[PDB]
Amino acid sequence: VLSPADKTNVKAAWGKVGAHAGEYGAEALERMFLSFPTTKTYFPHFDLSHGSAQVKGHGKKVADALTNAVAHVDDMPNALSALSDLHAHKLRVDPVNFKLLSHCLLVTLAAHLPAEFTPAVHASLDKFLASVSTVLTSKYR
């Protein structure tokens, strides 16, 4: 569960992302494909090459789902139910992969927000992502 400071921390860290969310989503993705090649098994129909816009296109989508979750930090389950419906029933992504992407996102953020990526902010973001991941896999069975 997100505490008031978790929320505050994620509203502010994400706030700074501002503009690059999509840019950042894309990189998180590239970081995941590369470090955790097993993750590529879900994106067989994609171009997984540096700068593919399939990846850029996908990145932005991810980042907007996160922006939305942030915006409804107080009602995440409802805010992303559509997205859980989808991952649960159509994509059927092994839950373990949510943890790998989340990590790549944390790596991406730390790489772009030197100044705001504090222990406190790091902790908050990690919990945030895990709750996002939890929401997303809630309808698997």
Binding site: P37, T38, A88, R92, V93, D94, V96, N97, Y140, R141
Partner: protein
């Protein structure tokens, strides 16, 4: 995989009483039912809407025995599950796009099926050797993923 000979001897020994048909059928069936997202690789098997729809499906079954049958044979190469599985590795990666985590899932369903079937005989220690087996298999199969 690091098996003791007592470990290896006990593996071998119960393996000898495996009816691979029904055990492979049971193992793959249970997977699809317990971890329903593993079903994503078998829509072409047909109706998987129920445990019965799934357990009783000839496709599940025959795939079960196929898999369990390839399982059986790395037991003959406990010393090189790696080279034993290299091609299957590439095929699951390169062609089937199987998330290797599914392999772990399988190993655990299996260990559960074996217990189910051997009751009392699938002892703390027999489980333990098998756990080592299904873990080496999962890794050998995941080996060539790139």
């Amino acid at each position: 995989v690091h098996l003791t000979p007592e470990e290896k001897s006990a593996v071998t020994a119960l393996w000898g009483k495996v009816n691979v048909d029904e055990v492979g059928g049971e193992a793959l069936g249970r997977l699809l039912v317990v971890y329903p997202w593993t079903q994503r690789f078998f829509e072409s098997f047909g109706d998987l809407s129920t445990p019965d729809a799934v357990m009783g499906n000839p496709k599940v079954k025959a795939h079960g025995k196929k898999v369990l049958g390839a399982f059986s044979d790395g037991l003959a190469h406990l010393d090189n599950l790696k080279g034993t599985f290299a091609t299957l590795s590439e095929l699951h990666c390169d062609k089937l796009h199987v998330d290797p985590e599914n392999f772990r899932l399988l190993g655990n369903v299996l260990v559960c099926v074996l217990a189910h079937h051997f009751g009392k005989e699938f002892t703390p220690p027999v489980q333990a050797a098998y756990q080592k087996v299904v873990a080496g298999v999962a890794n050998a199969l995941a080996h060539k993923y790139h």
